[PDB]
Assembly symmetry: D2
Homo-oligomer: 33 residues x 4
């Protein structure tokens, strides 16, 4: 159903935002070496 | 080369955030259907 | 700590590939509509 | 339209696959330092 698809995209969005945060954190750690 | 890897991660971050924004837009359009 | 950053990037890669797979699945479901 | 959405997801998929390739490449470069 379309609602299942919309929820999955929201779940994907939450995780992608977490991934961005983690990549930004890794970028910061590399810069403080 | 570490500063270059840092720049590449920033370019990836940039594109990932744009992708989040496009997926958010898709999620929104689907909701209007 | 570099080996740990490498492990984290692998964990991110893992999740990003899973996300690609879920988005591919969504693309497919939308096509069947 | 749904076709516009499906095309955009395909375009997003192509880019995400490129991002995965680039993150894997960065992981490899860090491991050869």
């Amino acid at each position: 159903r379309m609602r299942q698809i919309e929820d999955r995209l929201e779940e994907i969005l939450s995780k992608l935002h977490h991934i961005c945060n983690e990549l930004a954190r890794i970028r910061r750690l590399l810069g403080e070496r």
